[PDB]
């Protein structure tokens, strides 16, 4: 019940689509700049108490970092960022989807942090024991609001079955509460900045609709302000 260190800030997921529609006129690059600034803030304020992991989804999940302490250094991250180039603009729009990143994100949140492992080392069979609440941040170019709603459904069913699998596993944990941050980017000028609607006892969901540019970084900053928590 120690909700302090076990806040959603302790677990941060970044999912950005490297699908070629995010290279419309390097748009993903801009999203990278904003998300990298958020990741800067988290490590600087909370050197080892707020943790961040990053995922890219060019038709498949490409995870660039782990919960471990060594990965939580921005230079190590930047090497992996430079490794992924720009999405091929002539490549198949089919098969490319952020869903791989979201499913991998659920798997990453099920994974334990080193501090959570220390808590397991001390604790033993206590009620209201250590919880596993986390936050997911997705940045993408969305097509329809129904697209976003189906993504919410996918995440919910993924969490349900993944917790079913992880409950019997005693080297990974179930998720008490996830938080979902949905971010859509239109460059020129449909998603609605839909209010928070926590869809399940485990699931929490949020929707936003904002254009490109660091007003998104400021909105991120407002989120980080809630996320100092």
């Amino acid at each position: 019940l120690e909700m302090k260190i076990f806040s959603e800030s302790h677990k941060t997921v970044f999912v950005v689509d490297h699908c070629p529609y995010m290279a419309e006129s390097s748009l993903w690059t801009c999203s990278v700049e904003s998300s990298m600034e958020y990741c800067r803030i988290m490590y600087d304020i909370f050197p080892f108490k707020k943790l961040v992991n990053f995922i890219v989804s060019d038709s498949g999940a490409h995870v660039l970092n782990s919960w471990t302490q060594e990965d939580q250094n921005l230079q190590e991250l930047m090497a992996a960022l430079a490794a992924v180039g720009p999405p091929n603009p002539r490549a198949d729009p089919e098969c490319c989807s952020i869903l791989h990143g979201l499913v991998a994100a659920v798997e990453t949140l099920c994974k334990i942090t080193e501090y959570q492992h220390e808590a397991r080392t001390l604790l033993m069979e206590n009620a209201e024991r250590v919880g596993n609440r986390g936050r997911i941040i997705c940045i993408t170019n969305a097509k329809s609001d129904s697209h976003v709603r189906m993504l919410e459904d996918c995440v919910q069913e993924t969490i349900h079955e993944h917790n079913k699998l992880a409950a019997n596993s005693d080297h990974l944990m179930q998720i008490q509460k996830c938080e979902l941050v949905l971010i859509h980017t239109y460059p020129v000028g449909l998603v609605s900045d839909r209010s928070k609607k926590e869809l399940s006892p485990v699931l929490t969901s949020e929707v936003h609709s904002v254009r490109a540019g660091r007003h998104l970084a400021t909105k991120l900053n407002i989120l980080v302000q809630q996320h100092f928590d």
């Binding site: 089919e94 791989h100 069913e157 079955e161 699998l165």
Partner: peptide, 23 residues
Amino acid sequence: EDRLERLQEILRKFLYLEREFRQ
């Protein structure tokens, strides 16, 4: 495990469902 294949099923499932908006 026996049901991680259901994780892959979910991923694929919603991947096909995504095409309607993708197209």
